[PDB]
Amino acid sequence: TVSHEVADCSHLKLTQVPDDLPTNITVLNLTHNQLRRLPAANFTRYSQLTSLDVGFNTISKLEPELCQKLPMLKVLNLQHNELSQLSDKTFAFCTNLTELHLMSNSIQKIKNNPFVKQKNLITLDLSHNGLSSTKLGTQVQLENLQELLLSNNKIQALKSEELDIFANSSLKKLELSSNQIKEFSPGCFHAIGRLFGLFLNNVQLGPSLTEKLCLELANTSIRNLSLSNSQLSTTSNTTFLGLKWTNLTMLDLSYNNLNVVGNDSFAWLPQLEYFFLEYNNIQHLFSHSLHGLFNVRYLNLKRSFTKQSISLASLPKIDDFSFQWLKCLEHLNMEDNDIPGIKSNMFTGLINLKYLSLSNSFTSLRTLTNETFVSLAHSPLHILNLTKNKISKIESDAFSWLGHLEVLDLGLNEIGQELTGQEWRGLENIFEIYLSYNKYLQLTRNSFALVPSLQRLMLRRVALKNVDSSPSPFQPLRNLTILDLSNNNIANINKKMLKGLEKLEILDLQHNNLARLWKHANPGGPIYFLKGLSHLHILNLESNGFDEIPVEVFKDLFELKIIDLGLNNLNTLPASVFNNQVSLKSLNLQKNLITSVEKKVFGPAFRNLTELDMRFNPFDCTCESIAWFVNWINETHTNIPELSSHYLCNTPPHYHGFP
Amino acid sequence: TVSHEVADCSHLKLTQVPDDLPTNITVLNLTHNQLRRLPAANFTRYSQLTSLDVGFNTISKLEPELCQKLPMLKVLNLQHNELSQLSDKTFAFCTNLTELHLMSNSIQKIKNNPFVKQKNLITLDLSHNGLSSTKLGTQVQLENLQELLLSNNKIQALKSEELDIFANSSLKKLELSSNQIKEFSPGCFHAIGRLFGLFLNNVQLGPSLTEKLCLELANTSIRNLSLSNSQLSTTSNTTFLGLKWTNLTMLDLSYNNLNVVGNDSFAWLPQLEYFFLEYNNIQHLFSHSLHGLFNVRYLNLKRSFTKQSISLASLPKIDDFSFQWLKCLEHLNMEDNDIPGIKSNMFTGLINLKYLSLSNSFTSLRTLTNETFVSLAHSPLHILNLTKNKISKIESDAFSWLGHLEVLDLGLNEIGQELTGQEWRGLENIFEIYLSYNKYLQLTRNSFALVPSLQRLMLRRVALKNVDSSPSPFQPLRNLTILDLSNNNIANINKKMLKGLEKLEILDLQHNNLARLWKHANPGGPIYFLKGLSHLHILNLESNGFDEIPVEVFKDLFELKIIDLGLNNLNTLPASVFNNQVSLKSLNLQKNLITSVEKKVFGPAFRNLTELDMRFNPFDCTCESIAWFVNWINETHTNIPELSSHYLCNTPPHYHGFP
RNA sequence: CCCCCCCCCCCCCCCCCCCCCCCCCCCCCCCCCCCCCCCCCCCCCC
């Protein structure tokens, strides 16, 4: 049991408490053990404990003397025990506890008054118990109790007198999840002095019982009310009438299989700010369905509509001016839906929208016409997600109405076209554009001429074509910092492609075909496309098939810190190639054909590093090529993973396999 | 001008005849030179010449004294000269010549009698001349002349008196190709004593002029008659009436753009044995169209039918019982056609067929039903070709009627199915089966159980599946000698796949994935699937990705002569692996990772060879690994191509690039 | 004999990620052949 400040005995197969520990220990963890009983005679030495986790054990019963030896104990964790018997003296001397977790204790019934003797308890948990009533005592106690759990119990009814013991208690979290509760008594929730949160998740209520609960919850200080997986199939206008007299701010209806949402149902929630309806089966949405929610600031509709069926083609249709009431909506999630498309008035009325997500939200939004996003003209949208919508074509002025757009994601689509440059018109504040994993893209001389403020440009695995045009397509991108052109099988690159991009920091060119551009036999000479990038930090050149590196390629990367050259065919490197890399930190040369590591080339590179990866290289165990390398390895501070497992010699055969 | 027995001066830019040659030279070749004139005063030394080729020169005129110095001259080759003037004395002293080629001499008119003085001439050529008449003299000469060319001339008519000089001459080949001849005179061909062959290729005759020619050719000893590219658009029953009185055996109508073949047209050729109709545009074939050809032994119909057109879908249709008259047909070529398919009576009546080719002959023969080849039941067919017919499915008993089939070719198709084994039923005499370049094949335990006599089996690039069944699919193939399983990406092979195939000689397994089966870390041990093949001769294992070879793999290949292991990842080979290869002749190890060549492993292999290919290997210039190799290279007889260009050292760097 | 609670260990299935090897298709470049066209120089014939 290793212990420097806290003691851990997780999965150590301990049966009895250890007797050799420092006296000043604060936390004693004995989880996942086989302690049948816990005598208090062995806790004389341990008198400074604050947290005592004895969960996941076979403890049957305890004794009052246990708390005598722990006067400063604050956490008494008894998760998943066999403690099914409680008495007044069980927690008598214990009064400074701030947590008492008793989950899966198989407690049947609270007998008289076990929790009276403590008053500073903050959190109490009784989940996975056999309790059938919520009574926890006779008189009033647990004044400072903030949260209480009763989930996974056998409670069938809630009586007012059962919770009368909390007449002066502020319950910030009252869990009643997974309870077979079907009856509500008048004034049951009014017994609690300060009620802030309810969680009736996985409780089969139904519209009638939900309406009764809403009526019973009227005129209280409730703040959060979650009804997840409540089997709330249908909603009526009077279902949430009782919530009018409250100040509810967060509501949840997730996984309720809500077949139809009623008309003007949520008119009684003027103070609602957070709304959750994900994973539902709404078939039709009415214009006045969302009436009265003019204060919500967060709406979640992930998979909130019914999925398409070939039997009837029942596509969930959203009526026009549906969101005209959500004036204060600022975050809208609508992923994993099957909406037929965007109409001329689908998003009208959203005057505060800031984040709209439509990932996999449409059955087939193949063409982005200039009138597709007309409804978002008055929405100051900043981040728009359109991934996995099977978009195949983008027309001119597609995003003309999104003047405030900053982040645009069009990846994971089938966008196949040529960027004429007018597709991005109207994006005066765009910063990041994602176009990776498309069908095919064809760049022109003015593909990005209308987005001079762009900073990120991801074009990974998009089959780039005509990137070697005489005018560089990235010339207008003066503020570009991150550029990704990987997995495009790029073959020809002009030497002026990256000219003028002094602010470029991360450049990815892995999984391309640029071997010919660096060979000295290339007609016209080697292509030096890595000149002037004084601010380059991360350079990735994996799987480019390079056979030789010209001497003056890295002559300008003074601020380079991470350089990747793995999976190439490098065999020999010219001397004085890493002198300019005075701030290098990580070097990657795995799976190459390097045989000699000399201080002529790797000297300045290995001046001071943090990572080094040259694992799968056929090194040569010779005094003129490996002596300096092993001498540097002997005394250094750089981290070399798998140094003795993969840095192996191949030649000569006398030293074949020798590290 | 190198010369050991004959003299060659081809493209040597010679202007005058050389004067330093052996006297006993027999052949003097001066082709492609710039000899303006050929004086006979320089031929005093050369008196033993037999063949004198002065073709492709600028010779203008000759003198009779030239033949005086060459009494034993037999070939006087004067191809492509400016000799446009002839006289009686030009070929006076020349009498022992057996060949006189005068093509492209720009001869306008034969004046009086230039060919009288010789009588032993055999071959005479006058192609590409400006002759307008066939007169070659006044009296009769050239008694022993066997062939004569008049192609590419300016002849417009053929008169009987023009060829009267051959009253006692046997012309075995009379070329009149590319002649604008439009008039035929009576008795023109009867002047020649023995006429055996005519070649009117590329002569625009037409049906009427063709009929006139046939009438004029009646009652002669003609044997071959070719009318290739004669613009014979249409044929009538009376077109070839005149050929009845002859004994014609070979006829040609190739490239005639024959739109329609007449009914009962060829009834006048009872002795025809060879028939050519390739590259025609026949649209409809009648049942009685081929009547009277009961003696033809070779029919060619390559692209003899019109191609399909989307405008009208005019697929060339063949009437039933079309070939019922060709009783003696033994070789039928019908490639590059667009026949809709095979009917129930397409090939009925062919009782002597031995070779049927249907490569790219059908528009879409997708399914080979059991009734597809019903017409071939009575044909003793031996070789059948069905390549490039886009066959996609084969049913049971497809080849049940082909009991005499020996070679079957089904490659270059889209055959995708699983071989249940009944597809080959009825092939009791099959020897070779070609199935390469199909869509996908799935083998079972009894895929080839009905073909025990098979000897060749090509399955190259067919995407073989389930080849690793517990019963080897090749078990019934006891007589199998050549097996091809390359380019199938085979991954798993059982050790008993080739058990019982002692007669296997050529085995191909290149472009597969068998690296795991030979690694010593493979669960269950390495797979020794090359045991018992004592008669194996050619072994091909290219691009299998092998990393190590178990010692006892080649312990049984005593008769192995050619072994291929290139394009693999071999780095080191265990000692005593090539001892059993006592009859090895060719070793291939190119593009591997071999670094050391030691006599422990390569000793017995290099005992006596003819070829060695270890070019693109990273050798190691060390006294313990390359000294024996270079010593063996210094004194040996094996052919090592590109020894000084690609056998280069890579390590140590002091000897980097040194051969 | 029954219903539950753990700790340890051994298997089965599914999903995700990564590595090795290989095939097919396509892209970039180079080389070797065949055909056609153009241009330049020189030598002849009518």
Author numbering:
A (entry chain A), B (entry chain B): 29 to 687
Paper text:
The closest contact area between the dimeric TLR3 units is composed of the negatively charged N-terminal and the positively charged C-terminal residues of the neighboring ectoTLR3 dimers. To test their role in TLR3 clustering, we made two charge-reversion mutations. The N-terminal mutant, NT-mut had a triple mutation of K117D, K139D and K145D and the C-terminal mutant, CT-mut had a triple mutation of D523K, D524K and E527K of ectoTLR3. For the cryo-EM study, the mutant ectoTLR3 domains were produced and mixed with poly(I:C). The micrographs of the resulting complexes show that the clustering of ectoTLR3 is significantly reduced or entirely blocked by the mutations. The dimeric structure of the mutant ectoTLR3 is still superimposable with that of the wild-type ectoTLR3. Therefore, the effect of the mutation is not due to a conformational change of the TLR3 nor the blocking of TLR3 dimerization. The TLR3-RNA interaction alone cannot explain the “ordered” clustering because the entropic effect will randomly distribute the bound TLR3 dimers along the dsRNA strands. The long-range charge interaction between the ectodomains of the TLR3 dimers contributes to clustering as shown in Fig. 5.
